[PDB]
Design a protein around this ligand. Structure first.
Ligand SMILES: Nc1ncnc2c1ncn2[C@@H]1O[C@H](COP(=O)(O)OP(=O)(O)OP(=O)(O)O)[C@@H](O)[C@H]1O
Ligand SMILES: [Mg+2]
Length: 541
């Protein structure tokens, strides 16, 4: 029946549901509206999830899994995974197929199996509230997730016993949450998302026309090196160096001490969003030949700000890029929305307010907006939420080059995504053994006047006269906006394919110029195409 919305976070997860017109964030059994994305396998053979796992992490470093979102859908040889292997206290391994897996108590486990434990806890939280079984869910992912990362997140949902009705990206979710407020129509917003695992900025248009409120992503980009875990690392390094200065001991080779220090550092960071100073007090942190040793280090907000200032400042250039990619000025941004617990740092809030020249909206909850928006999307699917449309359409026509230097369109401009279209082409010359698939974007009929998106060859064509071979070309744009182009020789069975990433933005100013350019050249483009036609469309070598 009902469709729950789940924010599956690097650090914390959250589940919400539509209660008629208003979404409700649901509390787990401890009373908490968020649940740590932490999974622990205990000595006695049971699996802990959430705060119970978090509480015993410091004593069970090998078998307490966290930050698995950094691994989900990734290959073991991925740079981020290799970077992750050294710092993580649990064992990260290569699966037989090369994926990044984990090993706990001799058991090899794929990331989706681990994240499924967190999603199952979100599901029971909802089932407890509703008093009925729950199986339909909208699950969110970062806007920077690729196909493999999205697919692995869907698999995690299914392993949790959920029907994954939709995946949507976290900034769009936040925008749906904000867009519930009154007076939010026909505005451009900036979603500044500083979570545990990454920084992400999205520019989203919320328009209201003929009673329908539409949500469209105009630009997005992210940086996984600017997340709250990186803030923690700066403070941890400071505490390590300070303890060496104070007592001549380097804690880095002591895993138990480093786990306690990581937890204390994060708590000190959080406290310094409220206070001007805090005390990191860790008794019996280690010992040497002269007995036990104890840590007591005062950290001021000014010191923390000095340690992470570069991280905060590195979030500004991604903002400038997103605005360039949307073709907008800061003066076009009508509201700024902060998402993510790391945006509660006063320094972050001031830097964002300074850049946009306006205070971020304070009626958006940075810890819950993503889950709320996922629940809104669920309400759209059931009909509980009316007059709301997530708008994702192609900005420009997409096609391939055919004989005579012509652009042949496979997907027309303004086609709703996801979409799939195929057309059969043939060879231009007798006994042609290969064709070149040149993928093009734009509105002109001359292939050379459009943008080239990539190209690949299909060879192995059996000898035959021109026009006889049947080459099926398929364009498929998936829900992640990624364009998949394939060419298949129907008589030989051979196929080749490429993947084309989504554009980082949609610049309507420039798109409309291109459209007007094409309209201004419409008759000239027709005459060009017509006498090329005087020679099933054909492909050259
Ligand atoms: N009051 C605070 N001040 C500063 N940092 C905070 C505060 N509260 C939480 N954090 C930090 O925010 C981060 C967690 O934020 P959040 O729960 O939004 O992440 P997430 O959604 O799980 O991550 P992602 O979006 O990367 O999947 C952690 O680094 C945590 O230490
Ligand atoms: Mg998040």
């Amino acid at each position: 029946g009902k469709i729950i919305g789940i924010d599956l976070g690097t650090t914390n997860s959250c589940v919400a549901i539509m209660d008629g017109t208003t979404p409700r964030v649901l509390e787990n059994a401890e009373g908490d509206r968020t649940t740590p994305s932490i999974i622990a396998y205990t000595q006695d053979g049971e699996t802990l999830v959430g705060q119970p796992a978090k509480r015993q992490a410091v004593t069970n470093p090998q078998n307490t899994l966290f930050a698995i979102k950094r691994l989900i859908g990734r290959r073991f040889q991925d740079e981020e995974v290799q970077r992750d292997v050294s710092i993580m206290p649990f064992k990260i391994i290569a699966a037989d197929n090369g994926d990044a897996w984990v090993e706990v108590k001799g058991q090899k486990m794929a990331p989706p199996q681990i994240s499924a434990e967190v999603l199952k806890k979100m599901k029971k939280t909802a089932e407890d509230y509703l008093g009925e079984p729950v199986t339909e869910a909208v699950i969110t992912v970062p806007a920077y997730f690729n196909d493999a990362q999205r697919q692995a997140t869907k698999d995690a949902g299914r392993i949790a016993g959920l029907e994954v009705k939709r995946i949507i990206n976290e900034p769009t979710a936040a925008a749906l949450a904000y867009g519930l407020d009154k007076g939010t129509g026909n505005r451009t917003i900036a979603v500044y998302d500083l979570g545990g695992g990454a920084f992400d900025i999205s520019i989203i248009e919320i328009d209201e026309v003929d009673g329908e409120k539409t949500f469209e992503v105009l630009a997005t980009n992210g940086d996984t090196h600017l997340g709250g875990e990186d803030f923690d690392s700066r403070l941890i390094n400071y505490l390590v160096e300070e303890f060496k200065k104070d007592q001549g001991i380097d804690l880095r080779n002591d895993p138990l001490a480093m786990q306690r220090l990581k937890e204390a550092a994060e708590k000190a960071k959080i406290e310094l969003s409220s206070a001007q100073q805090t005390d990191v007090n860790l008794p019996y942190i280690t010992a040497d030949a002269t007995g036990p040793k104890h840590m007591n280090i005062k950290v001021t907000r000014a010191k923390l700000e000095s340690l992470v200032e570069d991280l905060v400042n590195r979030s500004i250039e991604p903002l400038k890029v997103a605005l360039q990619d949307a073709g907008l000025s800061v003066s076009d941004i009508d509201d700024v929305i902060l998402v993510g617990g790391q945006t509660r740092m006063p320094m972050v809030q001031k830097k964002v307010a300074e850049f946009f020249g306006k205070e971020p909206r304070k009626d958006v909850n940075p810890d819950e907006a993503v889950a709320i928006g996922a629940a809104v999307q669920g309400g759209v699917l059931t009909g509980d939420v009316k007059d709301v449309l997530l708008l994702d359409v192609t900005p420009l026509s997409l096609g391939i080059e055919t004989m005579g230097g012509v652009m042949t369109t496979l997907i027309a401009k303004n086609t709703t995504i996801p979409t799939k279209h195929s057309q059969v082409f043939s060879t231009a010359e007798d006994n042609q053994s290969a064709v070149t698939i040149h993928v093009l974007q734009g509105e002109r009929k001359r292939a050379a006047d459009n943008k080239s998106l990539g190209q690949f060859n299909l060879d192995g064509i059996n000898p035959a006269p021109r026009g006889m071979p049947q080459i099926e070309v398929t364009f498929d744009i998936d829900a992640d906006g990624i364009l998949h182009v394939s060419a298949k020789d129907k008589n030989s069975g051979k196929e080749q394919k490429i993947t084309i990433k989504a554009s980082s933005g949609l610049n309507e100013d420039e798109i409309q110029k291109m459209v007007r350019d094409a309209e201004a050249n419409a008759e000239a483009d027709r005459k060009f195409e017509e006498l090329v036609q005087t020679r099933r469309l054909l492909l050259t070598g």
